[PDB]
Curated annotation (Swiss-Prot):
Protein name per the record: Beta-2-microglobulin
Quaternary structure annotation from Swiss-Prot or TrEMBL: Heterodimer of an alpha chain and a beta chain. Beta-2-microglobulin is the beta-chain of major histocompatibility complex class I molecules. Polymers of beta 2-microglobulin can be found in tissues from patients on long-term hemodialysis. B2M alone (not in complex with HLA-I) interacts with M.tuberculosis EsxA (ESAT-6) and an EsxA-EsxB (CFP-10) complex; the tripartite complex can be detected in the host endoplasmic reticulum. The B2M-EsxA complex can be detected in patients with pleural tuberculosis and is stable from pH 4.0 to 8.0 and in the presence of 2M NaCl.
The Ig-like C1-type domain, residue ranges: 6-94
Compartments (UniProt record): Secreted; Cell surface
Protein family membership: Belongs to the beta-2-microglobulin family.
GO biological process, one term: negative regulation of forebrain neuron differentiation
Illness the protein is tied to: Immunodeficiency 43: A disorder characterized by marked reduction in serum concentrations of immunoglobulins and albumin, and hypoproteinemia due to hypercatabolism. Patients may suffer from recurrent respiratory tract infections and severe skin disease.
PTM comment, free text: Glycation of Ile-2 is observed in long-term hemodialysis patients.
Portion of the parent chain present: 21 to 119 of 119
GO MF term set: identical protein binding; MHC class II protein complex binding; peptide antigen binding; protein homodimerization activity; structural molecule activity
Organism encoding this protein: Homo sapiens (Human)
Positions of post-translational Pyrrolidone carboxylic acid modification: 3
One GO CC term, this protein: MHC class II protein complex
Keywords: Amyloid, Amyloidosis, Disease variant, Disulfide bond, Glycation, Glycoprotein, Immunity, Immunoglobulin domain, MHC I, Pyrrolidone carboxylic acid, Secreted, Signal
Name of the gene this protein is made from: B2M
Cystine connections: 26-81
Amino acid sequence: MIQRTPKIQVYSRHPAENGKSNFLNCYVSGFHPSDIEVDLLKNGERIEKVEHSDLSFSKDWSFYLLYYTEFTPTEKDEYACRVNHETLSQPKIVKWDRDM
């Protein structure tokens, strides 16, 4: 058996401009086993409004997932990716960093 902790990257499809329609992405990669919970949060609240995702498997025993939703960024809204996985002692919350 193998367990691997997920890598989590949160990023917008295009550079973020307030009031411009866009896509927010969570790429959750390199995790094992596949059991996982992933959500995008808008100021702490689960974004339900359509969710697309994409799962894949690499033969070194690792799963890869792209999770994304349409969003119009504003100055005041905070976004984060919330991930739970058995390798984590607590749910992991990774904030979207608009600038870096």
